[PDB]
Amino acid sequence: MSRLEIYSPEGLRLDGRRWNELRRFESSINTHPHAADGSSYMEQGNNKIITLVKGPKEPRLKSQMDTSKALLNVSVNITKFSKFERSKSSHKNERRVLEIQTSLVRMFEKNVMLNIYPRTVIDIEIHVLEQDGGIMGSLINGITLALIDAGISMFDYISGISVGLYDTTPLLDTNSLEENAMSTVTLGVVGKSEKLSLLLVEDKIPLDRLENVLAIGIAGAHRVRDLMDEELRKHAQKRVSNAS
Template identity: 35%
Template structure:
């Protein structure tokens, strides 16, 4: 199938290096300590953060740091055909774990000992790149909750189809079976915290990153192309970080001037 037309346009009319339209909104859940909605094109995700609060199970309490928990789920209505079991399957358990590890790495947990932070993310519309959207939404929600973070972690995916590197894959491109990477990135520290590679043969590069790899490795990808694809994803992360920062600054200013003196 042709994913990039001779004119250089993708199926949804984007250029290969173009991201989908992103939109973020803070304060979507009234009762949560922090919450956000994040959209990347037709992918729409809602995140809510509760905490830091008292640990529910005393045995899990840690006297030197906070416990971070994360739950990822997809709404029944998020996909084309209605889902029977929106959570608890292997895929959502894995994504919960990935999000938890990514967020835990950037939360300053040692500042909130003996407490727990709960992150709930739910996919409202799925059109590819749900895990990136979830990480972005979770970052926004954590920032809204006033939880101290090392850096704003953002995430974006990139793939390689029709011998072209493509940024921010949608569902059709994602399910084409080509190699793709999902990158979690800390823009200030200039570090990659998450790297998920799917359908890729070469994983020699792994030594360079504190990486986590899943997926089957069958399609071939030369190492320099991989570097390109990954660089593209990192660029996407940077663009998202700029947008998130803008939204947060706007929100902070608003809260401040509304409160007055």
């Protein structure tokens, strides 16, 4: 029994949001010029991520080398101050995390034009600072910045969002309070399409909603890569207008 109010009959959420609404969504480009040529910062609500990309460059060992394409390393940093309650132990080989480290690779095996970057290394650095739930799709949207943040060869935008289900009703952009309150699904959505990169369900879901549930998140996901685009573009105008 929860002593609180999940979703109002008057249509409202905890901050008063509707079921089809987002948090405040902020990106940034070239946050760290002195660090790497890929440096981008995310605020999606209180989900705050520093995203860092190194490459395309020489390996540390000739063993870790291919004569066909690039490699992709995922290093996730969950701080012990990432949550309200401070976690005791470190996470650096936690089997929960390694799954995502697998996950973003296979999500991003297929945007990178791998053949045109052979014998070189791409390393993607993650710094999870403030954690607000919706944690999975929070990452991917930070990734899509960071590859463009160096301008690496690719096909498309890739969008990510967790969308939750309170009993019948979809919830775009849940939080961790709502995440522990109901069943949620995250979608790794590619560009403008209807094709998926990531699809992950932990919670128990009745089958019959799911087609409708999947039909929800696309309009959210399309508005994601929407808001990424111009925000890059108004940055992109700021270069040449003052470069030239």
